[PDB]
Homo-oligomer: A and B are copies of this chain.
Amino acid sequence: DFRTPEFEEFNGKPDSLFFTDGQRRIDFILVYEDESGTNEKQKRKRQAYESNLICHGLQLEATRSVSDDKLVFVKVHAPWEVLCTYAEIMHIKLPFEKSRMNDFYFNPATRSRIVYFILSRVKYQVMNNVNKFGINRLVSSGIYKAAFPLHDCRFNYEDISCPSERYLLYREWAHPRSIYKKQPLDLIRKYYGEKIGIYFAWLGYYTQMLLLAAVVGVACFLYGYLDQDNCTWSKEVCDPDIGGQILMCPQCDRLCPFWRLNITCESSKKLCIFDSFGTLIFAVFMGVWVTLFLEFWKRRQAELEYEWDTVELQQEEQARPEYEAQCNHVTTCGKCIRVTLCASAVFFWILLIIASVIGIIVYRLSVFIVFSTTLIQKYLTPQMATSITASIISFIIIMILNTIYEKVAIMITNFELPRTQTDYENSLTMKMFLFQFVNYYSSCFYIAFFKGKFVGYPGDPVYLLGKYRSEECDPGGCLLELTTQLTIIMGGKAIWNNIQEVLLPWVMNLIGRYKWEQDYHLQPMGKLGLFYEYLEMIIQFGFVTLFVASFPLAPLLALVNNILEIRVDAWKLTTQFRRMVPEKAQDIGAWQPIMQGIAILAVVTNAMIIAFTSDMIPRLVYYWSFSIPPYGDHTYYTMDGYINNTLSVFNCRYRDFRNPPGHPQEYKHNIYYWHVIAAKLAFIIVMEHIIYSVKFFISYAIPDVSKITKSKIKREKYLTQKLLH
């Protein structure tokens, strides 16, 4: 009873918005074959389903495909009151000034959402059987193949009377015209959705906020670059007084020789550019900048929440595509035991990566020995050439481990109770990112903190891996092994996700020229819509904030990523992807505590890279307290002679600050060593407590209503009292 026409067709042109009649909008398209006993069962599954639509009341043109096995389409349109009768269920704002549910006097975006709400709350009435989201599982399983809203026009060219809302975004927002142009941001919302709109509004905030972070990135770096003297440090290590006659203790006692400081100046010239004084000014700025980042975006919050609707209290209950019986009327004891085993299954998988970086460092010691043997064009050194292959090889292994994690990520989070349609990805963000947190930064977490420490009495350190040889560092603080590996993991991932992803259709763009309801042909967006695209930035947000005490060019690599990155996926949002339902969304949600969890962690580690890694607190102590007649022989504060008179002595000279032989407590931690490690641990305390106060002081002073939306919500309340009466 009450079925579709089942056959209706007159294409004429692919630029039609009505079926055949005129003055009818088109809301969704659906597809199914049924040209040829399982197909009989799926047919009466589909055929009886159409009565539920027209008993609610729709109009259903079934235009057949002309070419392939993927047969006849179905079109749909909601009439005016049928549109209006669910405009009172949801709370939508029509047109200056907009009001709830009843307005003055539309758009296909709001048309397409409520018809999906009209779609999704439907029944198959067998055993409280499938709704449209169950038919989405029949899109996954049964007769229907793709249900989606009809996209506007062909992406390249521009019917004449149609609004060209796509064509604006090609000429003003997509790639091949108007790259370095500002943002059409409000129109992105009006055509695509809201989580898409809040995505680019986040990115469009993020680039301009990074732009402030990058002009200080070169003000810091050129300050480390303009000094041709380098004052004292990294200048007496290769002076024409020899000065590299120091004969340091070798590593591993098998084939390394008693080497010299002649082989440090090619590195240490490129070290004074990185830790001199500006990185004190830079890392104290980055903690301020990330504090300014969240707050000024929270001011960018609650205005797009105000200038758009983003209404919270709507009637999304639950979807739950999984299958589950019920007798309890509220096994859940066994399901909670199922919870603590399945969440600990990844707690057993995260430990592989921290075991995998152990696999990296044990390669770094072994390949160093053959690298020390074959010894001008590029002054590589048995150290930085080892430090390159410590990065570029491991960066592959990060990329290999990341890609294989992605398949087993979704293979287990559907096993880890994928309930409550948005909690499924909300369980995914905490279990995918924590892999990426330890996949990316834990290699740098070794090089920062675990690497340079823990040597021994004749340099007999604690032998990790049983009796296997421990790890040794380089005078200079071993910071270069971070900032080379920092720009390799960041700069490599930037290439691996753009040049592997923008030149992949760029060659498809040039191979097309040289050498219809067609818009189902585009790729369907996955249910995880913007998830990897958010994850790509949060990891990029990690490197620019966790490890920017060294390498202050990290915003400059992030900018040239982002101004391309905001355009490459925006191009693939239009030219590549099927038109998604414009679902309304709040703030970022799953990532909003993760950006908060990074910023309160970035203040801790930026102090720890300055103190515990960067060899400047040993410089600043020696400059301020060991050039005086207590423990020095200079007139006033200078480092005139620091490297010859800070190393230890062996009965050879190694890097640490232990006592020389012939001391009443010889080869023990001397007066100087505890004096830097006071001022090391001092600097952690003041720089945390200042920035954690500036985090308090900025957030308390300047508000989140700022100046206009505190008025424009009251200029709104100025006129509902003009309309209440």
* Interface residues of A, Cβ cutoff 8 Å to B: 604, 630-631, 665, 668, 670-671, 674-675, 677-678, 681-682, 684-685, 688-689
The 3 closest A-B pairs by CB, nearest first: A674-B674, A681-B681, A630-B665
Chain B residues near A681: list those with CB within 8 A: 678, 681-682, 684-685
User: In the docked arrangement, what's the CA distance between A630 and B689, Å?
Assistant: 35
| A457 vs chain B, min Cβ distance (A) | 12
The 17 listed contacts between A and B (C-beta, < 8 Å) are A630-B665, A630-B668, A631-B665, A670-B671, A671-B671, A671-B674, A674-B675, A674-B678, A677-B678, A678-B678, A678-B681, A681-B681, A681-B682, A681-B684, A681-B685, A684-B685, A688-B688
**Chain A interface, DSSP helix/strand/loop, else mixed:** helix
The docked-state distance in angstroms from the alpha carbon of A23 to that of B668 is: 93
Instruction: Please tell me how many copies of the chain the complex holds.
Output: 2
Report the bound CA distance from A365 to B665 in whole Å. 42
Residue of B at shortest CB range from A668? B630
A666, closest chain B residue (CB): B630
| C-alpha spacing A671/B631, complex, angstroms | 13
Docked pose: A677 CA to B685 CA in angstroms: 13
Contacts of A670 in B (CB 8 A): 671
A682 to B685, CA, bound (A): 9
Which residues does chain B contribute within 8 Å of A682, judged by CB atoms? 681
A444 vs B156: C-alpha distance in the bound complex, in angstroms?
A: 74
A684 contacts which chain B residues (CB < 8 A)?
Answer: 681, 685
Residues from chain B with Cβ under 8 Å of A685 in the complex: 681, 684-685
A684 to B604, CA, bound (A): 14
Q: A523: shortest Cβ distance to chain B, in Å? A: 37
CB distance from A166 to the nearest CB of B (A): 40
CA distance A668 to B671 in the complex (A): 11
**A604 is contacted by which of B604, B668, B671, B689 (Cβ under 8 Å)?**
B689
Residues of B within 8 A of A674 (CB): 671, 674-675, 678
Say how far A75's CB is from chain B's closest CB, in angstroms.
Answer: 33
Assembly CA distance A674 to B682 (angstroms): 11
A674 to B668, CA, bound (A): 14
A535 CB to nearest chain B CB (Å): 20
Closest to A665 in B: B630
Q: For residue A675, which residues in chain B have a CB less than 8 angstroms away from its CB?
A: 674
In the assembled complex, how far is the CB of residue A550 from the closest CB belonging to chain B, in whole angstroms? 21
Give the complex CA separation of A545 and B668 in angstroms: 40
- Please, which residues of chain B bring their CB within 8 A of the CB of A631? 665
Of chain B, the residue at the smallest CB distance from A675 is B674
What would 17 more interface pairs be, CB under 8 Å, given A630-B668, A681-B685, A684-B685? A604-B689, A630-B665, A631-B665, A670-B671, A671-B671, A671-B674, A674-B674, A674-B675, A674-B678, A677-B678, A678-B678, A678-B681, A681-B681, A681-B682, A681-B684, A685-B685, A688-B688
Report A603 CB to chain B, min CB distance, Å.
11
Closest chain-B Cβ to A181's Cβ sits at a distance in Å of 36
Closest approach, in angstroms, between the C-beta of A702 and any C-beta of chain B?
16
Closest Cβ–Cβ distance, residue A198 to chain B (whole Å)? 24
Bound-complex Cα distance A682 to B678 (A): 8
B residues within 8 A CB of A668?
630
Residues of B within 8 Å of A678, CB to CB, are 674, 677-678, 681
Which residue of chain B has its CB nearest to the CB of A670? Answer: B671
Q: How far is the CA of A688 from the CA of B682 in the complex (A)?
A: 14
Central interface residue in A604, A671, A675, A685, by most chain B CB within 10 Å: A671
B residues near A630, Cβ cutoff 8 Å: 665, 668
- Distance A630 CA – B663 CA, assembled complex (angstroms): 11
The residues of B that contact A604 with a CB separation of less than 8 Å are 689
Write the nearest CB–CB distance from A667 to chain B, whole angstroms.
10
Closest beta carbon of chain B to A605's beta carbon, Å:
11
Nearest CB on B from A54, distance (A)? 24
CA distance A665 to B671 in the complex (A): 11
Q: In the complex, A211 Cα to B50 Cα: how many Å?
A: 66
Cβ-closest chain B residue relative to A684: B685
Chain B residues near A677 (CB-CB < 8 A): 678
Determine how close the nearest CB of chain B comes to the CB of A171; give it in whole angstroms.
41
A479 to B668, CA, bound (A): 33
Give the complex CA separation of A674 and B669 in angstroms: 11
Cα–Cα distance between A674 and B610 once the two chains are bound (Å): 21
Residues of B within 8 A of A689 (CB): 604
Query: Which residue of chain B has the shortest Cβ distance to A674 in the bound complex?
Result: B674
User: Which chain B residues border A688 with CB–CB below 8 Å?
Assistant: 688
A135–B678 alpha-carbon span in the complex (Å): 66
* Alpha-carbon gap, A537 to B336, bound state (A): 42
> Closest residue of chain B to A597, judged by CB?
B696
Q: How far is the CB of A699 from chain B (nearest CB, A)?
A: 11
Closest to A677 in B: B678
Q: Which of A604, A630, A665, A678 has the most CB of B within 10 A?
A: A678
Nearest-CB distance from A211 to chain B (Å)? 31
| Cα distance A582–B675 in the bound complex, in angstroms | 63
Whole-angstrom distance between the Cβ of A668 and the nearest chain B Cβ? 6
**A674 CA to B678 CA in the complex, in Å?**
7
- Of all chain B residues, the one with the shortest Cβ separation from A721 is B317
| CA distance in complex: A670, B604 (Å) | 30
Q: How far is the CB of A724 from chain B (nearest CB, A)?
A: 11
Give A671 to B678 CA distance when docked, in angstroms: 11
Q: How far is the CB of A366 from chain B (nearest CB, A)?
A: 35
